[PDB]
Design a protein around this ligand. Sequence first.
Ligand SMILES: CC(C)c1cc(C(=O)N2Cc3ccccc3C2)c(O)cc1C=O
Length: 219
Amino acid sequence: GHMPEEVHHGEEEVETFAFQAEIAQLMSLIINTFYSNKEIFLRELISNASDALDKIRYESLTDPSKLDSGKELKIDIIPNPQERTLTLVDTGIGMTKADLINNLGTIAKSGTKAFMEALQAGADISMIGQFGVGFYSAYLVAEKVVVITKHNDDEQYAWESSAGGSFTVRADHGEPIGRGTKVILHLKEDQTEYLEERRVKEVVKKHSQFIGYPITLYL
Ligand SMILES: CC(C)c1cc(C(=O)N2Cc3ccccc3C2)c(O)cc1C=O
């Protein structure tokens, strides 16, 4: 053939953005600081999933066709010892691309700044959910976090950050999740206990025993 060259893709495939400084500061705090009960990261992620499931469960009352992307409201947890990943998948309402960028990169500024002020005044890490920013507690155990999300009104997107002050967002051309959010935790070397499922059960039973949706473990 010839050697055509595509000088210009139609649209930027991957976009990289900086966190608001206060979000980056909290992430650095979380990822570098000792905490005696890091298992609370799972409670915070399950709590976000439960809220997203509540959200779609409500809108299904007005519009039952919002469930055409999936009728089951559930949470699945998948440890992968060979990849050192722990994955949380929910069939909640999901996030549009705009809300993915805004919620994780920008408007968490107020909660993260108030939480750091509370920490300086004597609060501790386990209170992070009272400031609406419990998601960042993932970096207690993870060196890298991927968020895959699909909202009925938008396309499936992938967010990722290793807490170096920036994150990337891209169209996800991967396994389609239908609707909801998938959080993939790339675990730190010394936190692989959360790949053992005797441990994961322990943590769910301790912290999330009264979530109103089924939690299934895959191993
Ligand atoms: C990345 C993190 C913040 C997260 C987001 C969602 C999500 O898609 N939301 C959460 C929420 C809450 C209230 C209304 C709508 C939505 C939409 C989720 O299901 C799980 C997590 C795992 O921590």
